[PDB]
Amino acid sequence: LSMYPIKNLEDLYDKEGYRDDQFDKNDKGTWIINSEMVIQPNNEDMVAKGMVLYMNRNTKTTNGYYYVDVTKDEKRYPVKMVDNKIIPTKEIKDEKIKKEIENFKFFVQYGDFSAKYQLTNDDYNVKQLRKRYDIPTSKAPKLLLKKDIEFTFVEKKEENIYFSDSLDYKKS
Ligand SMILES: [Ca+2]
Numbered sequence: 001l002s003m004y005p006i007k008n009l010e011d012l013y014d015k016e017g018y019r020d021d022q023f024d025k026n027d028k029g030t031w032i033i034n035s036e037m038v039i040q041p042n043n044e045d046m047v048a049k050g051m052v053l054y055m056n057r058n059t060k061t062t063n064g065y066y067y068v069d070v071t072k073d074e075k076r077y078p079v080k081m082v083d084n085k086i087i088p089t090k091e092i093k094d095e096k097i098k099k100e101i102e103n104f105k106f107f108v109q110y111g112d113f114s115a116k117y118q119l120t121n122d123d124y125n126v127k128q129l130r131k132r133y134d135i136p137t138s139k140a141p142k143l144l145l146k147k148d149i150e151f152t153f154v155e156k157k158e159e160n161i162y163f164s165d166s167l168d169y170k171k172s
Helices: 009-014 093-102 124-132
Strands: 029-039 046-057 061-071 075-081 086-088 115-118 141-144 148-155 160-170
Touching: 009 029, 009 046, 009 086, 046 075, 061 093, 075 093, 124 148
Parallel strands: none
Antiparallel strands: 029 046, 029 160, 046 061, 061 075, 075 086, 115 141, 141 148, 148 160
């Protein structure tokens, strides 16, 4: 987690990950960057919000989608990513969706550092998440590093608040 933060996404275009015999030799590979806030308050609806981008190093173009996901006990919005900036490709009528996208940063852009940790609200990353999101709890989440970063706030089987962040590298 030394690299965190990568404030400019375009940097990623020039960083290579794990490749194998299966990997094409033509292919520079693709980055699959996903950040997701999940918030499930007690025995009501869960709403999960995030975004997925796809950074094809060959074309050096990036599209993906902002997803909103309510689920009892999924709407995607198509974005592209030019010049370290996420922009919507299908029209959005909603204003609150048009804005979260505009003010959206991936955790790798702002985050600053299996594995098992109990954090304080003095921690930097917990403060980053609280400021940026509307988190319905006061307690200091755990950190779960399996790349997969998770901050889990509340796990009770009747309510579940958590944040996950991944960066992955695949063939295109
Ligand atoms: Ca930390």
